[PDB]
Amino acid sequence: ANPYGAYVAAPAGPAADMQQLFLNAWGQRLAHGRVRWVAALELHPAFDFFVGVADVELPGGDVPPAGPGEIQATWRVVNGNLPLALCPAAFRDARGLELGVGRHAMAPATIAAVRGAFDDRNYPAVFYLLQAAIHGSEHVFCALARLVVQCITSYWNNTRCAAFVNDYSLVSYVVTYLGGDLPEECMAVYRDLVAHVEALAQLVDDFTLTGPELGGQAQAELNHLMRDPALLPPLVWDCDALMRRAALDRHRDCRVSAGGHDPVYAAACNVATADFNRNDGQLLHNTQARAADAADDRPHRGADWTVHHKIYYYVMVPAFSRGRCCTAGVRFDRVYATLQNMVVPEIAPGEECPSDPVTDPAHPLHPANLVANTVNAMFHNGRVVVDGPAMLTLQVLAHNMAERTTALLCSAAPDAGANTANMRIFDGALHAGILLMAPQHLDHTIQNGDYFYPLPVHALFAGADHVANAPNFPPALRDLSRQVPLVPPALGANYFSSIRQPVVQHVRESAAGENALTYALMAGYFKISPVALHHQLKTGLH
């Protein structure tokens, strides 16, 4: 048999290496046997029965100790996990559809805008490096605020498309703060986006009952996955979701492995502090508004924040990307470098700052100044228009920066499952990572592994194109990958994800408008425990 979806490895140091260490040990295991989930033992709905692994303590291990393949079973958590056989896609779609009527609904515009962003193969690379530099930091988003307003307007005017939709934190800000700074029709989009994620959040409370607090965890946490503090979103800039998580009753038994080390926090990082090559499992927790509010212990953002993120990444993203997209770790040195390597000609004494880059030869984006391998070059390729001062704000990065993108493997035993009565749930996630939206041109900087390296934390985000066209991709597996999510066993396995293939499969083939497909998923994300059903039933979910 093929244990791919069955096995779960433990963090193998160098995040930017992980994914490779993988395709070099499972190259055979994969091309050989066949994979089930990616498409006999359907003994029960509330569970998943598969050809286990035998004697191995799942949490660790580099490769499956080939041998007596026993048969294990895992608890499908959300109802969304019931195979598409037992639960037709066409149905779940219809479910969300009727579920939609009477609730929020992203306007035609906002959809075409955001989708477009995601489907744009020429999406200005600069934006990623910028996003990388603006690592979830609100403080920094505020600095480069001028710069940003430019990119967004720039891009928007070129093609009505939301500038940074691939990152909630930014999208969050762009709503919080560049009020009358972006064109009307355009700010609209960014708002609408959050306005939706706001409704999807309300949906949970709409089908949860207002009562006691079971197991030190509010009802909604037992009745729904997104609202469940046990699952941290795929991508985490700070350490909020990670703090609150470790702050759960023993009867969960949470285990988080940071790149392979007990995760130690960090309140900040300079240019003196920053160690791009650090392998010790220390996570930056610096994303505050004021540098004064500096913390190492307490969390910064708040309870809801992290939620909306999960809502965005697990619903909104799939909703728009339909799977064509993938999470990746960043090479901050490579970035920070070419980033703070610009060319701003001296402002002509007596003259005013260059406004137009097609004429004034003193404009950093005038062809005359476009030096190869310089951030000036990039802005040009992206058909982006940013003036000199804006470009200079990048001086901030030296003050507030993020060093390494860490691979996170967390886990725990089920909640309202004690009457269920071993196998624990596994979930991956990236600390300093970003979501590569559309797949940029094969031999270019984004794909060339220049600044960013592909590293899927979950089946939901693992576009073949990103991983297949990667730097050292075994040409043998090219075929396989063209139809099988390659999430590193170090980051989790299908039969253990709080959300398995059915869901993925759903998105991939679903054929509903985003609004519909949105609510659809948000629904599928409800729990399955008796209590869940209790609530879901009372409120009238089904």
Residues 6+ apart with CB under 8 A from 368: 361
Q: Measure the CA angle with vertex 26, ends 254 and 434; round to 5°.
A: 55
Give the sign of the dihedral formed by CA 454, CA 241, CA 270, CA 380: positive
9: tokens are: 């490895």
- Residue 120: CB atoms within 10 A of its CB come to 15
Distance CA 410, CA 59 (A): 10
- Taking only Cα atoms into account, the Rg of the chain, rounded to an integer number of angstroms, comes to 23
Q: Describe the crossing of helices 126-133 and 145-158 by its angle, rounded to 10 degrees.
A: 160
Distance from the first to the final alpha carbon of the chain:
37
Mark 317-354 as b/e (b = at least 16 C-beta within 10 Å).
bbbbbbbbbbbbbbbbebbbebbeebebeeeeeeeeeb
393: tokens are: 């704000």
Solving technique:
X-ray
Distance CA 324, CA 96 (A): 22
Distance CA 108, CA 171 (A): 19
Tell me the residue length of the chain.
Answer: 542
Distance CA 288, CA 433 (A): 18
Ordered DSSP codes for 2-16: --GGG------S-HH
Which resolution, in Å, applies to this structure?
A: 2.9
Q: Describe the crossing of helices 514-524 and 501-509 by its angle, rounded to 10 degrees.
A: 170
Distance CA 305, CA 194 (A): 11
408: tokens are: 């996170």
Distance CA 169, CA 142 (A): 12
CB 260 within 8 A of CB 241: no
Q: Could you tell me which of 288, 244, 197 has the C-alpha nearest to residue 410?
A: 244
Distance CA 255, CA 296 (A): 20
Partnered with residue 428 across adjacent β-strands are 409
Residues 6+ apart with CB under 8 A from 424: 58, 59, 253, 255, 411, 412, 413, 496
Ordered DSSP codes for 353-403: PP--TTT-TTSTTSGGG--TTSHHHHHHHTT----HHHHHGGGGGGTS---
CB 379 within 8 A of CB 495: no
Backbone angles phi, psi at 274, to 5 degrees: -55, 125
Give the sign of the dihedral formed by CA 346, CA 349, CA 351, CA 353: positive
Residues 6+ apart with CB under 8 A from 250: none
Distance CA 232, CA 498 (A): 11
